[PDB]
Write an enzyme that holds these catalytic residues in place. Structure first.
Site, PDB file in Angstrom:
ATOM      1  N   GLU C  66       4.836   4.346  -2.111  1.00  0.00           N
ATOM      2  CA  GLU C  66       4.136   3.319  -1.354  1.00  0.00           C
ATOM      3  C   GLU C  66       3.079   2.641  -2.222  1.00  0.00           C
ATOM      4  O   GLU C  66       2.495   3.246  -3.125  1.00  0.00           O
ATOM      5  CB  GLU C  66       3.503   3.928  -0.097  1.00  0.00           C
ATOM      6  N   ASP C  94       7.559   7.205   1.363  1.00  0.00           N
ATOM      7  CA  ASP C  94       6.196   7.047   0.869  1.00  0.00           C
ATOM      8  C   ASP C  94       5.929   7.817  -0.415  1.00  0.00           C
ATOM      9  O   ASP C  94       5.273   7.289  -1.319  1.00  0.00           O
ATOM     10  CB  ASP C  94       5.191   7.488   1.938  1.00  0.00           C
ATOM     11  N   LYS C 120      10.052   8.336  14.055  1.00  0.00           N
ATOM     12  CA  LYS C 120      10.383   8.340  12.631  1.00  0.00           C
ATOM     13  C   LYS C 120      11.641   9.157  12.350  1.00  0.00           C
ATOM     14  O   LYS C 120      12.487   8.756  11.536  1.00  0.00           O
ATOM     15  CB  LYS C 120       9.204   8.873  11.816  1.00  0.00           C
TER      16      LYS C 120
HETATM   17  C1  LIG Z   1       1.724   0.570   8.396  1.00  0.00           C
HETATM   18  C2  LIG Z   1       3.264   0.346   8.611  1.00  0.00           C
HETATM   19  C3  LIG Z   1       3.679  -1.059   8.207  1.00  0.00           C
HETATM   20  N1  LIG Z   1       3.588   0.576  10.049  1.00  0.00           N
HETATM   21  C4  LIG Z   1       4.990   0.456  10.519  1.00  0.00           C
HETATM   22  O1  LIG Z   1       5.251  -0.317  11.348  1.00  0.00           O
HETATM   23  O2  LIG Z   1       6.012   1.278   9.965  1.00  0.00           O
HETATM   24  C5  LIG Z   1       7.049   0.572   9.252  1.00  0.00           C
HETATM   25  C6  LIG Z   1       7.886   1.597   8.367  1.00  0.00           C
HETATM   26  C7  LIG Z   1       8.660   1.139   7.334  1.00  0.00           C
HETATM   27  C8  LIG Z   1       9.397   2.040   6.553  1.00  0.00           C
HETATM   28  C9  LIG Z   1       9.346   3.408   6.824  1.00  0.00           C
HETATM   29  C10 LIG Z   1       8.567   3.871   7.863  1.00  0.00           C
HETATM   30  C11 LIG Z   1       7.837   2.973   8.637  1.00  0.00           C
HETATM   31  C12 LIG Z   1       4.029   1.392   7.741  1.00  0.00           C
HETATM   32  N2  LIG Z   1       4.809   1.014   6.701  1.00  0.00           N
HETATM   33  C13 LIG Z   1       5.444   1.933   5.990  1.00  0.00           C
HETATM   34  C14 LIG Z   1       6.379   1.631   4.766  1.00  0.00           C
HETATM   35  O3  LIG Z   1       6.863   2.549   4.215  1.00  0.00           O
HETATM   36  N3  LIG Z   1       6.738   0.305   4.248  1.00  0.00           N
HETATM   37  C15 LIG Z   1       6.229  -0.971   4.833  1.00  0.00           C
HETATM   38  C16 LIG Z   1       5.469  -1.805   3.766  1.00  0.00           C
HETATM   39  C17 LIG Z   1       4.843  -2.920   4.631  1.00  0.00           C
HETATM   40  C18 LIG Z   1       3.495  -3.051   4.714  1.00  0.00           C
HETATM   41  C19 LIG Z   1       2.964  -4.066   5.519  1.00  0.00           C
HETATM   42  N4  LIG Z   1       3.783  -4.891   6.219  1.00  0.00           N
HETATM   43  C20 LIG Z   1       5.127  -4.746   6.144  1.00  0.00           C
HETATM   44  C21 LIG Z   1       5.669  -3.743   5.341  1.00  0.00           C
HETATM   45  C22 LIG Z   1       5.293   3.264   6.326  1.00  0.00           C
HETATM   46  O4  LIG Z   1       5.976   4.271   5.560  1.00  0.00           O
HETATM   47  C23 LIG Z   1       4.520   3.629   7.364  1.00  0.00           C
HETATM   48  O5  LIG Z   1       4.397   4.777   7.636  1.00  0.00           O
HETATM   49  N5  LIG Z   1       3.890   2.715   8.073  1.00  0.00           N
HETATM   50 MN   LIG Z   2       4.794   5.896   6.017  1.00  0.00          MN
END
Ligand SMILES: CC(C)(NC(=O)OCc1ccccc1)c1nc(C(=O)NCCc2ccncc2)c(O)c(=O)[nH]1
Ligand SMILES: [Mn+2]
Ligand SMILES: C[C@H](C[C@@H](C[C@H](C[C@@H](C[C@@H](CCN1CCCC1=O)N1CCCC1=O)N1CCCC1=O)N1CCCC1=O)N1CCCC1=O)N1CCCC1=O
Ligand SMILES: C[C@H](C[C@@H](C[C@H](C[C@@H](C[C@@H](CCN1CCCC1=O)N1CCCC1=O)N1CCCC1=O)N1CCCC1=O)N1CCCC1=O)N1CCCC1=O
Ligand SMILES: C[C@H](C[C@@H](C[C@H](C[C@@H](C[C@@H](CCN1CCCC1=O)N1CCCC1=O)N1CCCC1=O)N1CCCC1=O)N1CCCC1=O)N1CCCC1=O
Ligand SMILES: C[C@H](C[C@@H](C[C@H](C[C@@H](C[C@@H](CCN1CCCC1=O)N1CCCC1=O)N1CCCC1=O)N1CCCC1=O)N1CCCC1=O)N1CCCC1=O
Ligand SMILES: C[C@H](C[C@@H](C[C@H](C[C@@H](C[C@@H](CCN1CCCC1=O)N1CCCC1=O)N1CCCC1=O)N1CCCC1=O)N1CCCC1=O)N1CCCC1=O
Ligand SMILES: C[C@H](C[C@@H](C[C@H](C[C@@H](C[C@@H](CCN1CCCC1=O)N1CCCC1=O)N1CCCC1=O)N1CCCC1=O)N1CCCC1=O)N1CCCC1=O
Ligand SMILES: C[C@H](C[C@@H](C[C@H](C[C@@H](C[C@@H](CCN1CCCC1=O)N1CCCC1=O)N1CCCC1=O)N1CCCC1=O)N1CCCC1=O)N1CCCC1=O
Ligand SMILES: C[C@H](C[C@@H](C[C@H](C[C@@H](C[C@@H](CCN1CCCC1=O)N1CCCC1=O)N1CCCC1=O)N1CCCC1=O)N1CCCC1=O)N1CCCC1=O
Ligand SMILES: CC(C)(NC(=O)OCc1ccccc1)c1nc(C(=O)NCCc2ccncc2)c(O)c(=O)[nH]1
Ligand SMILES: CC(C)(NC(=O)OCc1ccccc1)c1nc(C(=O)NCCc2ccncc2)c(O)c(=O)[nH]1
Ligand SMILES: CC(C)(NC(=O)OCc1ccccc1)c1nc(C(=O)NCCc2ccncc2)c(O)c(=O)[nH]1
Ligand SMILES: CC(C)(NC(=O)OCc1ccccc1)c1nc(C(=O)NCCc2ccncc2)c(O)c(=O)[nH]1
Ligand SMILES: CC(C)(NC(=O)OCc1ccccc1)c1nc(C(=O)NCCc2ccncc2)c(O)c(=O)[nH]1
Ligand SMILES: [Mn+2]
Ligand SMILES: [Mn+2]
Ligand SMILES: [Mn+2]
Ligand SMILES: [Mn+2]
Ligand SMILES: [Mn+2]
Ligand SMILES: [Mn+2]
Ligand SMILES: [Mn+2]
Lengths: 181, 181, 181, 181, 181, 181, 181, 181
Positions: C66, C94, C120
Site C-alpha cells: 500500500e 496491503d 473483506k
Molecule cells: C480506505 C479504503 C479506500 N477503503 C475502501 O473502501 O476499501 C477499498 C479496498 C480496496 C482493495 C482491497 C480492500 C479494500 C481502502 N483501500 C484499500 C486498498 O487496498 N486500495 C485502494 C487504494 C485507494 C485509495 C483511495 N481511493 C481509492 C483507492 C484497502 O486495502 C483498505 O483497506 N481500505
Molecule cells: Mn486495506
C-alpha cells in the site's frame, strides 16, 4: 478545547515558525491560541506582514523588533536608541529602519485604513515612530505618505492579505474574524 | 504501462520537484504521465521555463501562478486583481509581473513562434495579458516586442530548450515529440 | 472548494508524506480530496495504520504494498509470488509477511469489527491472504485469531485510532465521518 | 529579568528541545522561566529523565505523556485507557508502559527518595499507577520494588543526575536549588 | 552517445550512490557506462545485491569489499587476512563474514544458478571463499548449501531481482540484457 | 599506489566536489589521479579557478562548460551556438559569457603568462574564443586586455593561487609540480 | 573550573561557531576560556564584529584574516601581498579590503575610542593598515575618517555591541568585564 | 609548519570529528598537531578505537570518557563512582562498562601487546580498572582474559588498525611512527 476549525486553518495557512512565535507571544500575554482563535489568526497575520516588510529592501535594512520576547525586544530598542540617538518610544514598535532612521509600527486591519491609523497615532503620540497600515481589502496608509518600501513589495503584502481573506471566507471563518476586531 | 523510454528520459532530464508538479497537474486534468508521455515532457518543459523566467529579474518581481492547483492559482489571481485593480483574465495565466503590472502567458512550441503566438492571442482575446513564446529552435516572440527580461536570462532559457531537444533526439524521442504538438 | 474543515484537520492530523500518498491514491482513482474529505481522512488513517503495522516486528519483515501506484504495487506482488511460490491474489493487498509467508489485507472500520471482516473475506475469497481488522473503538480481529504482531504494537495502533476519533469529535467531524462508511 | 545565571546554566546544560518543552509547560501553567529559574531547572531535569526512561527498553515500549500540552496529554491518556481497559488516573502521569500495561509517574527529588515517594503515593491514591523516584544522590525507589527497566538504563539516569548536581554546585547554584524544593 | 534507454532506465531504477559506484568501477576497468549499458545495469544490480546482503544479519557482521577501488579493497582484504589468519584469496571477493570467518563471492546470473556457480568455483579454486549465487528467476545456490543469511533477507533480494526483470521487460530491454550475459 | 603525499595534499587542499570532478575528468581521459598526482593537482586548480571565475559577476552571467562530461559539455556548447549564433569552437572551452557573448578558455600556468597565452592562442586559432590566463605568481593576461571581471574577483583568484603555491612548497611538493608543466 | 557565569553567558550569547573559533584562538595562545572568561567574551565579541564587518559591503569584498590559525592567516596575508603588491604588515591584521586595497585592524574597546585607536596606531606604525575602532557605548573611529562601510552596517554593529553590554550588566558581569580591559 | 605529510595523511585517514577531538586534546595538553604529527596520528587512532569499542555491544552499554575535556571527563567519572559505588581511579580512564560495572583503559601499541599491558598495569595499580590492549599487528590482550566484547567487534578494530598501518607504510610514514613510540 482539543481544536477548532480556525486553529486548524491557522496551522495549515501560516508557516510553522510564524505559528510558534504567535503562540509564544499570546501565551506571554496570558492568551490561549486554542480558545482565542481569531486573535491567533491576527497575531500570525501581523507577524507574517512584519517579516515580509523586513524582507523588502536591503539585506540588513531593518531590525525586527516583533517576534521577540518583550525583554529582548526592549533590549534591542534600547541599543538602537543608545547608538542612533533616537527617542525611546513609549510603546514597543515592530521594526527599525536603519535607512530612514526611525521605528515602524505596522498595522493590519479589517476596518478602514483611516480608522486604525487614527487609533495607532493617538496611541503612540510621539510622531517620531512611523506608522504603516495595511488592510485586507488592499488599501494602505503610511505616515507622511512615506510608504518606505517599493510598490512591488507592498503589492506582495496586499496580495497575501487578500489570499488569507479568501481562504478564511471559503471556510466560513471570515465573518467572525471581521466582526472580532 | 510499467514504463516508457520517454518517461525515464523525463525523470532523468528534469528536476524531481518539476516532475512531481507536472504529474500533479496532469492527474488533476485527468491525464496519465505513464501513457501520455509526450504531454508529460511538455508539461515539465513548460514548468521549467516558467520557473527560470520567474528567476530572471528581481527577487520578488514575479508571482508564480503555474505549478499550483487551479483553486489556489485562481485564489492568487483574484488577490492580485483585487489589490492591483487589473482585469481578471478569462483563462489562468502563468505569471504576474509586479514591475510591469501585468499577467504573463508563457508558451513553448515545436512549431513556428508565429503560429503559436497567434493561437494564444486568439485564445485570451483580452490584450491585457502579456504573451511570451519560446521555441526549441531558439526563437522568441513577446507582445509589443516587450520581452520583459534581460537578453541573458532569455538566452539561458533558449539554451536549455535546445539541450532538451538534443537529448530527446539522441534517444530517438524528438521526432514523435515534435509531431505530437 | 478552497478548503473544508475536514481537510484542514487531516492536514494538521497526519504526517505530510502520508497526506501526499493519500492524495496521490485518490487522484489515481479519480477522487478529489478537497471534495471527498471523509474519504480523504479514511485513506490517511488506513495508510498510517499500514505503516505502523509494517514498523512492528523485524526491520525488513514486511514488504509494503500500500502507498504505491497500482502498477508498481502489482509489480512487487508479481515478484513476491514468483519468488516465494504464493498464489497471486485477485485483489491488491496491503502487505506481505516474509516471516509467515503471506499477504495481509488491513482494514480500519467505524462499524463492528465482525461486519467489516465478513465483507473483506467475502471479497477476497482466496483464504490465502491474511485479514487483520482494526476499529476506532479499540477492537481487532485477525484471520485464525493469528494477530501477526506483538500485543504492544497492536495497542499502539489502537491508541492512535482512538486519538484520531477524539480529535475529529472535538471538531464536530466524527459523526459525519462515522455515518459516511 | 534579562537573564540569571541559573537560566544561562540551564540553557547550556540541557538540550534545546528539552528547554523549549520546559518553557512551554511552565508558561502553560502561568510560570516564567526567567524568574522561577530553579523551577525551570527542575522541569528540564524531570523532562530529560522521562525521555531517558522512555529510551530504555524496546523501541515503542512506552507512550510518552509528559512534554505534551495537557489537552493532548489527556487525549492520549483517554485513548490508552479506552483501548487497554485501564482505570483513568485522577492526575496526569508521565508515561504508559505497554509491556507492563500501566501508567508511570516519574519523580526527581533533592530530598530523600522515601519522602517524595510517600508524597506522590498519597497524591495519586489509585495504586494502579506505578511510581518511580530518582534522587540526585543516586538512590531510586519504585512501587513493589519493580524498577521496570534494566539496571544499566537506571544507572545512566543516576549518573546524569549527579553530573547535573556537580555542574550546579561548581556555579554556586546547587544550594539554592536544593533548598528550593 | 548522449544517452540510451538502458542508461535512463538504470538511472531511474537504482539509487544514485549505487549508480555512481558502478560508474566509477567500470571507468576504473576501462568501460563506458554510456556505451556498455547492459554491463552498466549488471554492475548496478550486483552492487545493490551486495549491499542488501551486507544489510542482512547483524549491524557489523560483514565487511563490504565490493564498491571500493581495488587498491582500498585489497588493503582491506590484507587487513582481514592478517588479523584473522585467513588465506589471501587469488581474486578479489565481495564481502567478508566475521561471524562465519570467510570471504563471500556474490553472483547474479540470467542463466541457470548451476552454470554460474560452476564457473565461479572453477575460477576461485580456493574452496575457502564461500560462493552465493542469485538468479533473476528467484533461485539461489550457496556453497555447502550454507546460505549464510535468513530466508527472509534472501527473499527480499530475490523479490528485488524479479522487480528489476519486470521493469526491464516492460521497456523491451530485458531480452538484450538476458542474451548479453 | 595506495597513496602519495601530493594526493593527500590535494584531498586536504581542495573542496570534495572539485576533487571528485577532477577524478572523473582524468579517468574519462584515461588518467589515474593516484599516479599522475601533479596532473591531479593541476585539474583541481583549473577547476577551482573556473568556478571562482563563474562566481564573479552576475548570478547567471556564465554558463560553466568545464566540469561536465565531454558529451554534455558539447551538448551545451551546441545549444549556446544554436541559440546565440556564435561559431562552434574547434576545441571545448571552459565558460560562456552571456554578457559579452563569447566563449572563455581559462588557463593556469606555472610558467610566464605570455608563453601559455601564446600556446593557447595558437591552439584555438579561432580568435572568437576569449582567452584569460592566470599564473601562480599573481600575473594575468586576457585577450584584447579585456579581463571580463572586476579587479577584486581576479584578485581573489590570484590570492588563492598563491596560497596553493605556498602550501605545496611547505610540503616540498612545489618544485616537482613547477617542473612538471 | 567546571564553569563560571561568564562562560555560560558567553555560550548562550554568541553563535556556536564563533565560540569554537574563540576557544581555538585562546588555546593556541596558551589561554584557557574556562579561567580567563572576560578574555573569552572579548575574543567572541571581536570575532563577531569582524564577521559582521566582512558581511557589510559586496559579496567577496573582504578577505577574513581573523578566525584562522596564525599559520594559515599569515599564508593568506603573504598571498594578498604578493598578488596586490601591498607592504607586508608587521602584525597580523583582521581583514583585507579588495575594494580599497588595504588591510584593516578592527578594535572593540570598553574605554574611549580615542585611547584605543592611539594604542593600535602606535602598535602598527605602518600607516598602510587601516584602523577601525568600535566602542560598547556606540562611538566609532576610523583612520582618515574613512569608515569603509555604509552607515547602516556600522549601526548594526554598534547596536549589537550595546545589546551585549546590557546582557552582561543584567547578569552583574559588565563591571568586571569593563575593569578587565 | 604550514603542513607535513603525516598531518595531511591524518586528515584524509580519520573522520573529521575524530580529528577535531584529537586536536583539542593535544592543545589542551600543550601539544601542537602540526609539529607532533606522530602523536597526532596516535591520538586519532586511540580515539577511533575507543569509539568503535563503545559502538560494540548494547546501545548504551558504555559511557565514553575519552574525547572530553578533562574537567567534564572527571565530572562524569565522579558521577559514575558516586552512583555505582566504584573506587575513583587515580588516572582518567577511557570508558565505563555499565554491564560489567568497571572502568576500561584502552591501549593501542606498535610494540608487543605484553610490554604495553605491563606498563599500563604498573601505572594504574588499582586492579579495579579493566585493561584492553590492541596492537597494529592484530594481537590483543585484556585483563583476566576477559575481552568484554564479541570476537567480531574486536576483529573489526584489528582490521582497521592494520589498514591504518598499511596506509602509513605506503606513504613511507610507518617506520618513523613505529620508532616514535
Ligand atoms: C480506505 C479504503 C479506500 N477503503 C475502501 O473502501 O476499501 C477499498 C479496498 C480496496 C482493495 C482491497 C480492500 C479494500 C481502502 N483501500 C484499500 C486498498 O487496498 N486500495 C485502494 C487504494 C485507494 C485509495 C483511495 N481511493 C481509492 C483507492 C484497502 O486495502 C483498505 O483497506 N481500505
Ligand atoms: Mn486495506
Ligand atoms: C533570525 C531568526 C528568525 C527571524 C525571522 C525571519 C524569518 C524569515 C525567514 C526567511 C529565510 N524565509 C523567507 C521564505 C520563507 C523563510 O523561511 N522570513 C521572512 C518571510 C517569512 C519568513 O519566515 N528572518 C529574518 C532574518 C533571517 C530570518 O530567518 N527573526 C524572528 C524574530 C527576530 C528575527 O530576526 N531568529 C533570530 C533569533 C530568533 C530567531 O528565530
Ligand atoms: C515556493 C515553493 C516552490 C516554488 C518553485 C520555485 C522553484 C525554484 C527553486 C530554486 C531554489 N532553484 C533554482 C536552482 C534549483 C532550485 O531548486 N526553481 C527555479 C529554477 C528551477 C527551480 O526549481 N521557487 C520559487 C520561489 C522559491 C522556489 O522554490 N513554487 C512552486 C509553484 C509556486 C511556487 O512558488 N512552493 C510554494 C508553495 C508550494 C511550493 O513548493
Ligand atoms: C521507503 C519510502 C517510504 C515508505 C514509507 C515508510 C514511512 C515510515 C517512515 C519512518 C522513518 N518514520 C517513523 C516515524 C516517522 C517516520 O517518518 N513510517 C512508518 C511510521 C509512519 C511513517 O512515516 N517507510 C518504511 C521504510 C522506510 C520508510 O520511510 N514507503 C512508502 C510506500 C512504500 C514504502 O516503502 N519509499 C519507497 C519508495 C517511495 C518512498 O517514498
Ligand atoms: C516524538 C517527538 C519528540 C519526542 C521527544 C523524544 C526525544 C528523544 C530524541 C532522541 C532522538 N534523542 C536521543 C539522543 C538525543 C536525541 O535527540 N530524546 C530521548 C533522549 C533525549 C531526547 O531528546 N523522542 C522520542 C520519540 C522520538 C523523539 O524525538 N516527544 C516529545 C513529547 C512527546 C514525544 O513523543 N514529538 C512528538 C510530537 C511533538 C514532538 O516533538
Ligand atoms: C559506508 C559508506 C557507504 C557504504 C554503502 C552502504 C550503503 C547502504 C546505505 C543504507 C543507509 N541504506 C539502506 C536504505 C537506503 C540507504 O541508503 N545501503 C544498503 C542498502 C542499499 C544502500 O544504499 N552502507 C553500509 C554501511 C553504511 C552505508 O552507507 N559503502 C560503499 C562501499 C564500502 C561501504 O561500506 N562508505 C564507506 C566509504 C565510502 C562510502 O561511501
Ligand atoms: C550546478 C552543480 C554544480 C556546479 C558547480 C558550482 C560549484 C559552486 C558551489 C557554490 C555554492 N559554492 C561557493 C562556496 C563553496 C560552494 O560550494 N562553487 C563556486 C566556488 C567553488 C564552488 O564549489 N556551482 C555553480 C552553480 C551552483 C553550483 O553548485 N557545476 C559543476 C559543473 C557544471 C556546474 O554548473 N551541478 C550541475 C549539474 C552537475 C552539478 O553538480
Ligand atoms: C568560510 C568559513 C567560515 C567563515 C566565517 C563566516 C561566518 C558567517 C556565516 C554566515 C553564513 N552567517 C550570517 C548569519 C549567521 C551565519 O551563520 N557569519 C557572518 C555573520 C556571523 C557569521 O557567522 N563566513 C564568511 C564566508 C561564509 C561564512 O561562513 N570563516 C571563518 C574564518 C575564515 C572564514 O572565512 N570557513 C572558512 C574555512 C574555515 C571555515 O569555517
Ligand atoms: C555524543 C557526541 C559524540 C560522541 C562520539 C561518538 C561518535 C560516533 C558517531 C556514530 C554516529 N558514527 C558511526 C559511523 C560514523 C559515525 O559518525 N562514532 C562511533 C564510530 C566512529 C564515530 O564517529 N558517538 C557515540 C554516541 C553518539 C555519537 O556521536 N562523543 C564524543 C566524546 C563523548 C561522546 O559521547 N557528543 C557528546 C557531547 C559532545 C559530542 O560531540
Ligand atoms: C495583532 C495585535 C496583538 N493586535 C493589537 O491588538 O494591537 C496591540 C498593539 C500593541 C503594541 C503596539 C501596537 C499595537 C498587534 N500587536 C502588536 C505588538 O506590537 N505587540 C503585541 C504582542 C502580542 C501578541 C499577541 N498577544 C498579545 C501581545 C502590534 O504592533 C500590532 O500591530 N498588532
Ligand atoms: C503544456 C500545456 C498543457 N500545453 C497546452 O496545451 O496549453 C494549454 C493552456 C492552458 C491555459 C493557458 C494556455 C495554454 C500548457 N499549459 C498551460 C497552463 O497554463 N495550464 C494547464 C495546466 C495543465 C497541465 C497539464 N495538463 C493539463 C493542464 C500553459 O500556460 C501553457 O503554456 N501550456
Ligand atoms: C588542467 C588541463 C588538463 N591542462 C592542459 O593540459 O590543457 C589541456 C586543454 C584542453 C582543452 C583546452 C585547453 C587546454 C586543462 N584542461 C582543460 C580542458 O578544457 N579540458 C580537459 C579536461 C581534462 C581534465 C583532466 N585530464 C584530461 C582532460 C583546460 O581548458 C585547461 O585550461 N587546462
Ligand atoms: C580580543 C583581542 C585578543 N584583544 C587584544 O588584546 O588585542 C591583541 C591584538 C593582537 C594583534 C593585533 C591587534 C591586537 C584582539 N586580538 C586581535 C588579533 O588580531 N589576534 C589575536 C588572536 C588571539 C585571540 C585570543 N587570544 C590571543 C590571541 C585583534 O586584532 C584585536 O583587535 N583584538
Ligand atoms: C594516545 C595517548 C596520548 N598515548 C599515551 O601516551 O598514553 C597516555 C595515557 C594517559 C592516561 C591513561 C593512559 C595513558 C593516550 N592517551 C590516553 C588518555 O587517556 N588521555 C590523554 C589525553 C591526551 C591526548 C593527547 N595528548 C595528551 C593527552 C590513553 O588512555 C591512551 O591509551 N593513550
Ligand atoms: Mn504592529
Ligand atoms: Mn503557458
Ligand atoms: Mn513526574
Ligand atoms: Mn560478485
Ligand atoms: Mn582551460
Ligand atoms: Mn582586531
Ligand atoms: Mn587509553
Amino acid at each position: 478545547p482539543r481544536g477548532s476549525h480556525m486553529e486548524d486553518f491557522v496551522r495549515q495557512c501560516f508557516n510553522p515558525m510564524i505559528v510558534e512565535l504567535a503562540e509564544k507571544a499570546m501565551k506571554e500575554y496570558g492568551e490561549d491560541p486554542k480558545i482565542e482563535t481569531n486573535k491567533f489568526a491576527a497575531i500570525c497575520t501581523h507577524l507574517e506582514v512584519c517579516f515580509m516588510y523586513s524582507d523588502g529592501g536591503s539585506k540588513h535594512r531593518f531590525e525586527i523588533i516583533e517576534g521577540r520576547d518583550r525583554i529582548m525586544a526592549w533590549t534591542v530598542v534600547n541599543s538602537i536608541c543608545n547608538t542612533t540617538g533616537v527617542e525611546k518610544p513609549k510603546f514597543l514598535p515592530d521594526l527599525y529602519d536603519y535607512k530612514e532612521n526611525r521605528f515602524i509600527e505596522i498595522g493590519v486591519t479589517r476596518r478602514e485604513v483611516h480608522i486604525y491609523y487614527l487609533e495607532k497615532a493617538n496611541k503612540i503620540k510621539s510622531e517620531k515612530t512611523h506608522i504603516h497600515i495595511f488592510s485586507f481589502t488592499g488599501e494602505e496608509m503610511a505616515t507622511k505618505a512615506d510608504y518606505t518600501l517599493d510598490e512591488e513589495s507592498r503589492a506582495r503584502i496586499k496580495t497575501r492579505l487578500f489570499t488569507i481573506r479568501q481562504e478564511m471566507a471559503s471556510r466560513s471563518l471570515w465573518d467572525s474574524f471581521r466582526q472580532s476586531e
